[PDB]
Design an enzyme around this catalytic site. Structure first.
Site, PDB file in Angstrom:
ATOM      1  N   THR A 189      24.901  10.246  30.843  1.00  0.00           N
ATOM      2  CA  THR A 189      26.193   9.860  31.391  1.00  0.00           C
ATOM      3  C   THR A 189      26.366   8.336  31.541  1.00  0.00           C
ATOM      4  OG1 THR A 189      26.739  12.048  32.352  1.00  0.00           O
ATOM      5  CG2 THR A 189      27.742  10.103  33.314  1.00  0.00           C
TER       6      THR A 189
ATOM      7  N   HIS B  32      29.484  13.037  26.625  1.00  0.00           N
ATOM      8  CA  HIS B  32      28.427  13.731  25.807  1.00  0.00           C
ATOM      9  C   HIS B  32      28.660  15.220  25.960  1.00  0.00           C
ATOM     10  CE1 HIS B  32      26.800  14.673  29.658  1.00  0.00           C
ATOM     11  NE2 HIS B  32      26.744  13.382  29.941  1.00  0.00           N
TER      12      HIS B  32
ATOM     13  N   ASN C  88      12.166  -8.565  14.636  1.00  0.00           N
ATOM     14  CA  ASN C  88      12.387  -8.588  16.097  1.00  0.00           C
ATOM     15  C   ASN C  88      13.278  -7.421  16.571  1.00  0.00           C
ATOM     16  OD1 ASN C  88      14.751  -9.481  15.025  1.00  0.00           O
ATOM     17  ND2 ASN C  88      14.894 -11.323  16.296  1.00  0.00           N
TER      18      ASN C  88
ATOM     19  N   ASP D 189      16.291  -6.384  16.362  1.00  0.00           N
ATOM     20  CA  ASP D 189      17.553  -6.633  17.069  1.00  0.00           C
ATOM     21  C   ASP D 189      18.754  -6.084  16.276  1.00  0.00           C
ATOM     22  OD1 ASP D 189      17.676  -8.602  15.027  1.00  0.00           O
ATOM     23  OD2 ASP D 189      18.150 -10.218  16.405  1.00  0.00           O
TER      24      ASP D 189
END
Ligand SMILES: *[C@@H]1O[C@H](CO)[C@@H](O[C@@H]2O[C@H](CO)[C@@H](O[C@@H]3O[C@H](CO[C@H]4O[C@H](CO)[C@@H](O)[C@H](O[C@H]5O[C@H](CO)[C@@H](O)[C@H](O)[C@@H]5O[C@H]5O[C@H](CO)[C@@H](O)[C@H](O)[C@@H]5O)[C@@H]4O)[C@@H](O)[C@H](O[C@H]4O[C@H](CO)[C@@H](O)[C@H](O)[C@@H]4O[C@H]4O[C@H](CO)[C@@H](O)[C@H](O)[C@@H]4O)[C@@H]3O)[C@H](O)[C@H]2NC(C)=O)[C@H](O)[C@H]1NC(C)=O
Ligand SMILES: C[C@]12CN(C(=O)OCc3ccc(OC(F)(F)F)cc3)C[C@@H]1CN(C(=O)c1ccc(S(N)(=O)=O)cc1)C2
Ligand SMILES: [Ca+2]
Ligand SMILES: [Cl-]
Ligand SMILES: [K+]
Ligand code: NA
Ligand SMILES: [Zn+2]
EC number: 3.1.4.39
Length: 805
Positions: free
Chosen positions: A159, A309, A685, A687
């Protein structure tokens, strides 16, 4: 401390929050223990309930009542929502035919259509069809407005991560709310569902819609409601706010329902007990729409009905215990349930080892219902790694299962029959989207899309400039009647070079050999044309990708494929080729097995070398354009150019070879031809963004050849599969993947079997959006099509999910 001795007199659900120890009357004061003494009496009236009856009509205003049925109530803005129906012979909104709302029909003084976001927790997408008989108001919104068959949440499908993703347009890794439960090692602080730490501003990154609105002069209703404020009161409060004078009235509002999630946890997503919560939510929607109709706002307000969801069947007995795998179970902390996150119980314990925890958790039991990952090896589509709050060790739990540390954790805490949190591709985790109002389209179905896209659209609805986010602005323009956002393609930053033949064979000392010394005027103008781009229209169908960063690269043409070759990374950034339905698969001829050929267009200094691969005992090599799909024995020599070579672990070559030898032809057969763009990705990394050269952690031994973390492919064809990929007149169809480039196949438990039993399953797991590849490579695809740019943006956000119906 709160001096709770002030009063809420005339301040009930005030919009600006006052600062302690002054007492609060806002819709959140309850959660802080800060409400004034008279908050319940003044602000939470319940007398006489929520509806007008025949005998209350025209009553004398009794200020004690929850809502009113007196003559003055419309001008007061506080009638019960069914006032006009009971007392003025009006119809309920749901009983009215729908009529297209071509333009906002708003009372004077409204500067813009207000936006109301009606969010429902745990509202699984199939409830729209399966509960349709008991949700007439929701069904009318759905069939009259704009709807998707479902909306994809973000991972984890919990949530808090999802509501804050709705509010910000950001992945949880960027907004910082990475689960319902978190430890931040920099703060040395824990975030919990229960309690006070979660209120501290340092948890909440990005810029949520209410802050975006306020900064740009659009007033916002307060989005959060204390759990004890009943739904009816939330609706009445919103409706009252909508009656404020023009200068005080917010333009954006949120309602939240804890249902159906609350009951789904107890009874499962389709428990017979679930009908009532669905009826009750529908009744609340009815109250809002009736209330808007009374205020003459039902053809003025844009309403979004959105879930965070879905909900899956999950029971106590379907729990895997780490104590069945690990000897050292007491030296770890697990965040448990529908996902797992593991870290050391004590940072002082130097005997803690993630490598051995992961191995102890890997393919240990035949039907194991979770799979361990280092976070950087999770499917890139989950975008779940770039945050210090996300533990290095992650368990992806199978749908319908839990993971816990020890059995005692489950029975000293069966209660539940539903849960959620699983992989956001799971069917049961999908949720809902409906848009209804003047700015949304009429009776329109749109394809499924991801909830990270909605912030941009909510900003468009309110005339706001969105803060920087992970949506792709313009990809949801097809939901909207007006207020569309018309982006321009990004400018190309680097233009390619087009090298001709510039080097003699003998200038290369690469340690490569090829059996290719075998000797024609007809066929010699032919080879020249191919190297100048004669077949480029066949193999590069949507224009060349644009390079959106500063670099040095060459376009290389060949009979069967075109590539953009990076002089910096010593390999292609992209390789583009088309495989028709008719194309034939051949083998690599015996004499050419270890063949690598210098490319006389590209200097030795900007080339890979075979010696490095020979010396690197871990690392082998593969090719981007597959030799198997060469159009002729002669064209096959091009596939062995050193400029088509890329580094590949032997374990990965198993995957790559099966994709290139078997799967590409299978897709071309099924899709009526495919265009393929493949390439390397470097994300050391983790990202989600293209690495610069100085971020690369691994090179082929003794060389400057950087090792990719991943390999991508984008596979495009005609949506109308009656037309061949290379002669398509209309919309496109795409699927893509970002396969991790790993030295082992530990992720695939069945990998000792034939590639036909596990490779395609691996690829499906690592399905991706073209937009994911764009972030990871700094390339922009589909630059030259006959399609509108917004349509292309939608295509770039498409995710092929490989779930059934
Ligand atoms: C999804 O969309 C989002 C939003 O567009 C994308 O995220 C952006 O990516 C940018 C590139 O990574 C990034 O830009 C950096 O900003 C740094 C300043 O950051 C602060 O200010 C912004 C603006 O208000 C704010 O949003 C940030 O908030 C983050 O951090 C706080 C906590 O610290 C959190 O509350 C918040 O949730 C958010 O966290 C997320 O981002 C950070 C990184 O900022 C992550 O570490 C977290 O894990 C989390 O994911 C900040 O408060 C700025 O300092 C950077 O500049 C450095 O790099 C440049 C390169 O141009 C270099 O030239 C500079 O010198 C500088 O380097 C110096 O610092 C280095 C590190 O210490 C050091 O190594 C050097 O030697 C130098 O000293 C950089 O420009 C931007 O912050 C985020 N925004 C957000 C909200 O996340 C995201 O990429 C998209 N995802 C995908 C897949 O597309
Ligand atoms: C925080 C809160 C939502 N809240 C609230 O009023 O929200 C208004 C809002 C509307 C739209 C927003 O975004 C927008 F507009 F963009 F769509 C954002 C917020 C009160 C609820 C307490 N909460 C829980 O206790 C809770 C409930 C369930 C779970 S679980 N087990 O994961 O299902 C976990 C925790 C959730
Ligand atoms: Ca990176
Ligand atoms: Cl969590
Ligand atoms: K090798
Ligand atoms: Na394996
Ligand atoms: Zn829940």
């Amino acid at each position: 401390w709160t001096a709770t001795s002030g009063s809420c007199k005339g301040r009930c659900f005030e919009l600006q929050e006052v600062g302690p120890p002054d007492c609060r009357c806002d819709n959140l004061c309850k959660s802080y223990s800060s409400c004034c003494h008279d908050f319940d009496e003044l602000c939470l009236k319940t007398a006489r309930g929520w509806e007008c009856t025949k005998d209350r009509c025209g009553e004398v205003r009794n200020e004690e009542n929850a809502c009113h049925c007196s003559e003055d109530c419309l001008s007061r803005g506080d009638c019960c929502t069914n006032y006009q129906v009971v007392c003025k012979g009006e119809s309920h909104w749901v009983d009215d035919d729908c009529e297209e709302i071509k333009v906002p029909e708003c009372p004077a003084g409204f500067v813009r259509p207000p936006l109301i976001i009606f969010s429902v927790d745990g509202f699984r997408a199939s409830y729209m069809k399966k509960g349709s008989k008991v949700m007439p108001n929701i069904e009318k919104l759905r069939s009259c407005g704009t709807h998707a068959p479902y909306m994809r949440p973000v991972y984890p499908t919990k949530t808090f991560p999802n509501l804050y993703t709705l509010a910000t347009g950001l992945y949880p890794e960027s907004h910082g709310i990475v689960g319902n439960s978190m430890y931040d090692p920099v703060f040395d602080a824990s975030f919990h569902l229960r309690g006070r730490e979660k209120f501290n501003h340092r948890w909440w990154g990005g810029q949520p819609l209410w802050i975006t609105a306020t900064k740009q002069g659009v007033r916002a209703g307060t989005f959060f409601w204390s759990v004890s404020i009943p739904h009816e009161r939330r609706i009445l409060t919103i409706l009252q706010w909508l009656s404020l004078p023009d200068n005080e009235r917010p333009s954006v509002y949120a309602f939240y329902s804890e249902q159906p999630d609350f009951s789904g946890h107890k009874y499962g997503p389709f428990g017979p007990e679930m009908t009532n919560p669905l009826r009750e939510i529908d009744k609340t929607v009815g109250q809002l729409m009736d209330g808007l109709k009374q205020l003459r706002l039902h053809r003025c307000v844009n309403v979004i009905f959105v879930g965070d969801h879905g909900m899956e069947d999950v029971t106590c007995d379907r729990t895997e215990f780490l104590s069945n795998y690990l000897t050292n179970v007491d030296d770890i902390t697990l965040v448990p349930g529908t996902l797992g996150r593991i870290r050391a119980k004590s940072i002082n314990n130097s005997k803690y080892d993630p490598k051995t925890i992961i191995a102890a958790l890997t393919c240990k039991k035949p039907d194991q219902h979770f799979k361990p990952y280092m976070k950087q090896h999770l499917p890139k589509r989950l975008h779940y790694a770039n945050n210090r709050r996300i533990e290095d060790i992650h368990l992806l739990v199978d749908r319908r299962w839990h993971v816990a540390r020890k059995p005692l954790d489950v029975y000293k805490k069966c209660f539940f029959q539903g849960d959620h949190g699983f992989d956001n591709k799971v069917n049961s985790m999908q949720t809902v989207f409906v848009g209804y109002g003047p700015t949304f389209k009429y009776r329109t179905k749109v394809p499924p899309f991801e909830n990270i896209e909605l912030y941009n659209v909510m900003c468009d609805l309110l005339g706001l400039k969105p803060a920087p986010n992970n949506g792709t602005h313009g990809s949801l323009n097809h939901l909207l009647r007006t207020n569309t956002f018309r982006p321009t393609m990004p400018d190309e930053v680097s233009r390619p070079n087009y090298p001709g033949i510039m080097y003699l064979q003998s200038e290369f000392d690469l340690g490569c050999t090829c059996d290719d010394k075998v000797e024609n005027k007809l066929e010699e103008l032919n080879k020249r044309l191919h190297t100048k781009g004669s077949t480029k229209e066949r193999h590069l169908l949507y224009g060349r990708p644009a390079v959106l960063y500063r670099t040095s690269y060459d376009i290389l043409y060949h009979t069967d494929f075109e590539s953009g070759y990076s002089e910096i990374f010593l390999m292609p950034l992209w390789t583009s080729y088309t495989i028709s339905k008719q194309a034939e698969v051949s083998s690599i001829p015996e004499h050419l097995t270890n063949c690598v050929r210098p490319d006389v267009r590209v200097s030795p200094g900007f080339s890979q070398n075979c010696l490095a691969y020979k010396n690197d005992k871990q690392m082998s090599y593969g090719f981007l354009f597959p030799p198997y799909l060469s159009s002729s024995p002669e064209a096959k020599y091009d596939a062995f150019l050193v400029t088509n070579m890329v580094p590949m672990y032997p374990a990965f070559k198993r995957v790559w070879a099966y994709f290139q030898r078997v799967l590409v032809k299978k897709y071309a057969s099924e899709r009526n031809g495919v265009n393929v763009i493949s390439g390397p990705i470097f994300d050391y990394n983790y990202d989600g963004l293209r690495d610069t050269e100085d971020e690369i952690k691994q090179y082929v031994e003794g060389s400057s050849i950087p090792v990719p973390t991943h390999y991508y492919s984008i596979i495009t064809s005609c949506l109308d599969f009656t037309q061949p990929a290379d002669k398509c007149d209309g919309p496109l169809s795409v699927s893509s993947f970002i396969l991790p480039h790993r030295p082992d196949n530990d992720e695939s438990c069945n990998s000792s079997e034939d590639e036909s039993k596990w490779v395609e399953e691996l690829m499906k797991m690592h399905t991706a959006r073209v937009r994911d590849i764009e972030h990871l490579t700094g390339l922009d695809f589909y630059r030259k099509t006959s399609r509108s740019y917004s349509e292309i943006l939608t295509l770039k956000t498409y995710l092929h999910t490989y779930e059934s119906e």
